[PDB]
Amino acid sequence: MYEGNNMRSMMGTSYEDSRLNKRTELN
Amino acid sequence: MYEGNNMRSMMGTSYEDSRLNKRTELNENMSIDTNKSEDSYGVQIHSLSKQSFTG
Amino acid sequence: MYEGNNMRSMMGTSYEDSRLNKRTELNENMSIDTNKSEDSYGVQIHSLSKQSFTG
Amino acid sequence: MYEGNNMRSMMGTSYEDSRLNKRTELNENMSIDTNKSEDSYGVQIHSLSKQSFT
Amino acid sequence: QSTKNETALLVAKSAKSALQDFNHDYSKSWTFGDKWDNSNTMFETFVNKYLFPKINETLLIDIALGNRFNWLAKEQDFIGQYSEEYVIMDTVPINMDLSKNEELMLKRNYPRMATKLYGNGIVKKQKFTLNNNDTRFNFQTLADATNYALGVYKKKISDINVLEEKEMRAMLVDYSLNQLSETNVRKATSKEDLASKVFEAILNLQNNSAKYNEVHRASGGAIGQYTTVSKLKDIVILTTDSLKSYLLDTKIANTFQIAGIDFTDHVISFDDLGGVFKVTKEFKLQNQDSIDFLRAYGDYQSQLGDTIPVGAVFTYDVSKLKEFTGNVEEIKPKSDLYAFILDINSIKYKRYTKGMLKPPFHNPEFDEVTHWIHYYSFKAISPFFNKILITD
Amino acid sequence: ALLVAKSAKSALQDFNHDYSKSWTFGDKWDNSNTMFETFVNKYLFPKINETLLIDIALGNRFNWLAKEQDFIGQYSEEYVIMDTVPINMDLSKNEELMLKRNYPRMATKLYGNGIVKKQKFTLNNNDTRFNFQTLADATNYALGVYKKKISDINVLEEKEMRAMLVDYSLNQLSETNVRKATSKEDLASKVFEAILNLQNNSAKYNEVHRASGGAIGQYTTVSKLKDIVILTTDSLKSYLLDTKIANTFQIAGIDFTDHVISFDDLGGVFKVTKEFKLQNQDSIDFLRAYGDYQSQLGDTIPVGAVFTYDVSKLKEFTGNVEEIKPKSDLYAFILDINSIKYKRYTKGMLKPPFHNPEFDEVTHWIHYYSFKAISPFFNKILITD
Amino acid sequence: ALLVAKSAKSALQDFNHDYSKSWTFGDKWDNSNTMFETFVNKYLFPKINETLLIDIALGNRFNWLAKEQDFIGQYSEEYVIMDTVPINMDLSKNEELMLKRNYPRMATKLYGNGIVKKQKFTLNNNDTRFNFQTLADATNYALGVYKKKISDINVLEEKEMRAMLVDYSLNQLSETNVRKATSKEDLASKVFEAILNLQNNSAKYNEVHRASGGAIGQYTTVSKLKDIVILTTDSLKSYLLDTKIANTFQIAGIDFTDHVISFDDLGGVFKVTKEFKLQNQDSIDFLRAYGDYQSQLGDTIPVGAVFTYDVSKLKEFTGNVEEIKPKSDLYAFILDINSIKYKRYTKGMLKPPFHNPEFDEVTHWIHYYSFKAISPFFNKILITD
Amino acid sequence: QSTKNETALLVAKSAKSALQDFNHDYSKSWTFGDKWDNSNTMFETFVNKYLFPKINETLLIDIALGNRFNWLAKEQDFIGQYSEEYVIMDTVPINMDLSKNEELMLKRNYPRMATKLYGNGIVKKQKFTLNNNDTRFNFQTLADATNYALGVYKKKISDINVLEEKEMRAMLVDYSLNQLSETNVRKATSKEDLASKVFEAILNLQNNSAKYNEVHRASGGAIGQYTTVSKLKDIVILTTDSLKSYLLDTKIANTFQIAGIDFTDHVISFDDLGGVFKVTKEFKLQNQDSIDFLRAYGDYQSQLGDTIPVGAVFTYDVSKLKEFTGNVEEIKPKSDLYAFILDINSIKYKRYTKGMLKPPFHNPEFDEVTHWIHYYSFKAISPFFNKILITDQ
Secondary structure, rough: OOOOOOOOOHHHHHHHOOOOOOOOOOO | OOOOOOOOOOOOOOOOOOOOOOOOOOOOOOOOOOOOOOOOOOOOOOOOOOOOOOO | OOOOOOOOOOHHHHHHHOOOEEEEEEEEOOOOOOOOOOOOOOOOOOOOOOOOOOO | OOOOOOOOOOOOOOOOOOOOOOOOOOOOOOOOOOOOOOOOOOOOOOOOOOOOOO | OOOOOOOHHHHHHHOOOOOOOOOOOOOOOEEEOOOOOOOOOOOOOOOOOOOOOEEEOOOOOOOOOOOOOOEOOOOOOOOOOOOOEEEEOOOOOOOOOOOOOHHHHHHOOOOOEEEEEEEOOOEEEEEEEEEEOOOOOOOOOOHHHHHHHHHHHHHHHHHHHHHHHHHHHHHHHHHHHOOOOOOOOOEEHHHHHHHHHHOOOOOOOOOOOOOOOOOOHHOOOOOOOOEEEEOOOOOOEEEHHHHHHHHHHHHHOOOOOOOOOOHHHHHHOOOOOOOOOOOOOOOOOHHHHHHHHHHHOOOOOOOOOOEEOOOOOOOOOOOOOOOOOOOEEEEEEOOOEEOOOOOOOOEEEEOOOOOOEEEEEEEEOOOOOEEEEEEEEEEEEEOOEEEEEEEE | OOOOOOOOOOOOOOOOOOOOOOOOOOOOOOOOOOOOOOOOOOOOOOOOEEEEOOOOOOOOOOOOOOOEEEOOEEEEEEEEEEOOOOOOOOOOOHHHHHHOOOOOOOEEEOOOOEEEEEEEEEEEEHHHHHOOOOHHHHHHHHHHHHHHHHHHHHHHHHHHHHHHHHHHHHOOOHHHEEEEEOOOHHHHHHHHHHHHHOOOOOOOOOOHHHOOOOOOOOEEOOOOOOEEEEEEEHHHHHHHHHHHOOOOOOOOOOOOOOOEOOOOOOOEEEEEEEEOOOOOHHHHHHEEEEEEEEOOOOOEEOOOOOOOOOOOOOOOOOEEEEOOOOOOOEEEEEEOOEEEEEEOOOOOOOOOEOOOOOOEEEEEEEEEEEEEOOOOOOEEEEEEE | OOOOOOHOOOOOOOHHHHOOOOOOOOOOOOOOOOOOOOOOOOOOOOOOOOOOOOOOOOOOOOOOOEEEEOOOOOEEEEEOOOOOEEEEEEOOHHHHHOOOOOOOOOOEEEEOEEEEEEEEEEEEOOOOOOOOOOHHHHHHHHHHHHHHHHHHHHHHHHHHHHHHHHHHOOOOOOOEEEEEEOOOOOHHHHHHOOOOOOOOOOOOOHHHOOOOOOOOOOOOEEEEEEOOEEEHHHHHHHHHHHHHOOOOOOOOOOOOOOOOEEEEEOOOOOOOOOOOOOOOHHHHHHHHHOOOOOOOOEEEEEOOOOOOOOOOOOOOOOOOOOOOOOOOOEEEOOOOOOOEEEEEEEOOEEEOOEOOOOOOOOEEEEEEEEOOOOOOOOOEEEOOO | OOOHHHHHHHHHHHHHHHHHHHHOOOOOOOOOOOOOOOOOOOOOOOOOOOOOOOOOOOOOOOOOOOOOOOHHOOOOOOOOOOOOEOOOOOOOOOOOOOOOOOOOOOOOOOOOOEEEEEEEEEEEEEEEEEOOOOOHOOOOOOOHHHHHHHHHHHHHHHHHHHHHHHHHHHHHHHHHHHHHOOOOEEEOOOOOHHHHHHHHHHHHOOEEOOOOHHHHHHHOOOOOOEEOOOOOOOOOEEEEEEHHHHHOOOHHHHHHOOOOOOOOHHHHEEEOOOOOOOOOOOOOOHHHHHHHHHHHHOOOOOOOOOEEEEOOOOOOOOOOOOOOOOOEEEOOOOOOEEEEEEEHEEEEEEEOOOOOOOEEEOOOOEEEEEEEEEEEEEEEOOOOOEEEEEEOO
């Protein structure tokens, strides 16, 4: 809930989940 | 001193002492704010204020 | 008194006086201004600077 | 040809021959400036300058 | 203490789990489910006895943990290694002996001096690896996982700061015990005695005294004297917490003419100023539980067979291990009745924190990000200023 | 043979039977040889002129701690990050040390739930009219019972918040935090030393070894003195105010009595060991006079129940009831105020009233949820004998 | 014989007999062997110079508690609502528990009437003129009698209030109110300790077990320090003024001596234990030496009787009177006012005189109604040996 | 045989190859040149017999392999690890009568809540390595190299589909053989008998009945009943191809297909159910031939001395190797006349495909980057829906 230094290096952005780009091919 | 190609990928700016950030701390004070029992001679309690400790 | 010459490059003026340049006593204080233990009484730490003393 | 999504990370941008940075060039000129003995006569010696290092 | 409860036997089966799926190269790939019964358990409610229990609240205490020494930090450049300082030793005047021969004018009396070569500091390092696979099996809110990833990072700087004050405290106490004169030490008898011997040790640092410094441990000063004063705006008194507490509740609280003689502005204090260890006799690592105890304090890089040099510093309670007994001694005063009254600007402390947050390394084979923190800290004590130890 | 001894005339007998005397002829009053004797007029009914209703509202002294949670879910979980010292770099090790893992480790503690508490009261519309002579006094009665039902909630939540602190001092909080005073004079200096000790970086002074994962490794924390509370009795705070504070020159600075909470006694709340069953009706009659309308002669009482009134003197509770009480009269329990957690749930606490219009007696209920726990991840020092 | 021993020539012989001497011829005054003896002149009457009437107006120390009533009706009552501690919610009880009745319970201590007091005095016209050489002295006498009757009312009323407070402190309050002290340096730290015991939520310090509906159950209340008064002797107040205040530096917080009503002597009053009847004539003369003109022989003294003067040394009252007082001078009764019910009706106070013209003496009366009671619903601590 | 050909001796000279310049740290630097002849051999045209043979086209054949059960996949946020589910039990409506105790208006009646708790899924991965200097030698355009690097990635997407389809059809067979109660199991005799039982067991669904779900093996559904209905748009028959070719070959399939549902699309069939193998005894890996066999299928991480837990699946044929025999059984239906009629809502299946392209590690020593594909897939099966198994066992 507290931000502090929220948007730090790559892991602190990795939990605010990223890039729903590829999915599987039938539907 | 001879410039050549000094603007470089990682090391040519690593001997130039990249970026002073995150100095170590005495914002969390000690011996001016803690290590302290020189409070006032004041008449009454309730200076306590229990906070939520999420961060 | 006996005037005569009163001029040799030394031992005339050296018999009169050489000019005072150094005076070896208290300009860096001791037991009058410094040698203190009569300091104040208040909130307590951090008047302690630290010099580089390169001179 | 085969379309897909070939805008990809480094190998998707590496088969189209990434940017030419260093040229490994003759600029310290060889056999047009050096490899000469074509200095002629002259009055005498020591136009020689000993430059300082870096 | 044996239990035949069905929910307890369901929890007791360690073969079903997040652990065996993440240890082996192949694993089970579906789940049939488990009948969860809250009956006769700790997790029992009265209206519905068949759900898994719930969390509404997940906290993460954060404490910031300051330093109490970083006004002494001079931000240096970290280039070159060898620093050096010197003084010119004293030469007393002699008598005019007119019977000596006239060629005494031609002989040179060179000024003699005393130096002290310091050297380098210590590049110090710590890291932490955050997971994207199994840390998310906990933390039922994404905000809780981001709070965790920030709280670990904020803890790393806090135990940089408490480590630097443990090392400064240990440097001052280890210097007070080992490297000193016979003139510098005093012997108190009790607490009311030390509280006045501190008051008469100030007014001794600020006289023209050839003693009270340690230029005989300097490079050229083995024979000769060197006189130094202090100014009382530069004196640090390093005591325990019992001495400062005794001052503030008895001596300051039970005198009438307190208006001048209060020295507690200059007193740094510690609750228990021995907790840091050294090395003697140069052992090495051979036991498994020893490095298992070392892993709990963040030290990842030690393997079995790594050797420890003759002056290494351990900074946590470490003398209970099987290898280290007899080779590891604690930096502590032996009496809990202790005062080290030293001149400030005798403590050089030059740490270097510019290239400190180095860029991470995403490790996508295990889907994790390791962060490193590097800093160079040089701490040393000059032998050319006035110091007094008061102990037992 | 008097008038006042004949109970077959009273107002109860008209509201006792399904049929009764539908008209009145009179009652032939005289006050001779009674309590209501008057010298001159022997035949007038005695007149009352005042009806007063002393009513006092009572506080809590733990109200600023009282957070307002949401009351969903059951368990609450609380954790820290353990210490991890910086290590030295050496350039002689292999470079596959770079892809090695240093996971951060923690230490947790899990908390259960609170309890939903309840009190009811019934106000009447036909019998209560007979006791008052104006409607303003009846509305004062109906308001004073409600203010009383709020005030004893406040008194109860004070009692079982000081009781849990005394219980945590006596039965938990292991020996490494307990300091031994000898008399009343040196305790007031042990407190002054402990307040200075709780403001250094220290792996001690907390109960992370009582936590789930804090058995190995260390954890350092501080306090502030704007977060430190000292919980004492009255014989210690009164001693501070009349003897130590009085007999010190130059006190301006070292008075810590803006962080002292005192009480009359720290034992007025009882527990249960060796669970029992309510088997005597003369003890249930004692329980009825504190509001317990639920109990009958078959009810068991578990091994953690609290009472907050003097219950141990009864024929049945002896040998089963222990008192949460400091045994020493030298008790200064120094806390960090963040270690207490006390969250309420007072949203739907006034229930819609059941009217019951045959007897015309409405009934009100009051329901609040209250959670009480103590965190181990903060600095605590107890001073006893 | 001597002239001054001859009662036949006195003025009383001319006013008790109905027929007396119309004329007189003088007498033969000589003071040769009397106390009225002058060296030079043996034949002159002794001359007196002055007659100073020493008259002191006396206060009450309880005039602020005196509220003025109307003197109508005789009963008044006070009730509180008892505590109802919140019980835990059970879910295994029967579902018909909501239909059950739970009435709040009262306390309801009931107060009776006051008692009308009365005093009279006779002013004569034909005998009083034989003293009082000037008429201004006679008018000063007639005014001083009246101003002494008013001061008698005030002293009687103060002594009865003090008697009521000491009589309530003894034998009426509980066991958890009496705190034992042992010296004079004690009962000054325990009085400072017992102040701010009244300022806690506690059911121990009232007397609701002496109320009607409060035999079983508790009632919590609090005090405010603008309602706390302390009743001691002059020994304890003298001790507080010369030792506890005079030998402390920081007196600027804890001086509570503006709440300490100190009395000179805490006993001069008496209560009848056993009902009796008067038979002795010196008992009558001793009773009407203090103004009891009513009582003759054979009169009844009831059980609840207060005498106000030292009367235990009579042959009738031995074994009947009580002497309500503290035993051993270490005494501190820490009230909380709003408890002292104290009412007084003094508007029909000066009655019209009766002239009685045959003896020619005017006769005045003074009536006043006074109610003195005390409420059990407030925090009270008694400290004694 | 052997050939004394001038061209074949030049072709088979392995000391001139490009592989000699990449498996030695010092090698040839300049090329002299070669005399290429197409005379009396292959690659021989009638005109200009001295030119090197040239490629008309190269063609990456990429078949888009599809997961048949992709439309069942919900997507979660990969937070926490326990999913649970619960229903409300039946309470049949009762008659009212005006002659009761009339304080039963006060009485209580709670819902009853049969549940079941489910564990976690597993995170699966695969990697591929593409370099920049050696693989350029055999594509002759930039476009063919980019299409190659794209087709390798699309193959790494398609074998995820192959894995998930074969994994779920292993789940549904292991379920019906080893978990299901013998109340849902009807037993046939012959093929036409089984066909009649399947066609009457389809119609045994769409009925408000409490007989066909395994709610008795839920957590709190032992006493009482739970009634389930199912539409036709969520009934799926799982069977074999040899038996789908007989169920569809009846007149009842024709009257299902005419003016109604696509019965060819509700019957999910495979050749024989199961190429997936389980583990019954915890063994270890000892032989290098088995290591090479596992490397042939992309399993790069497993080495010698690794142990395999009881219950691990394989998704390919492993059982011919020296230490898998006896320890490894097959998820395969006994007596292959077999049909498992399920409701398709019973397959609790959800994934987490968010961020399944992790950023590459470059490795510039050999200039070969590597991409990883991590994804989380949760496979379960719920007891609160109609299931019928029809076999000869």
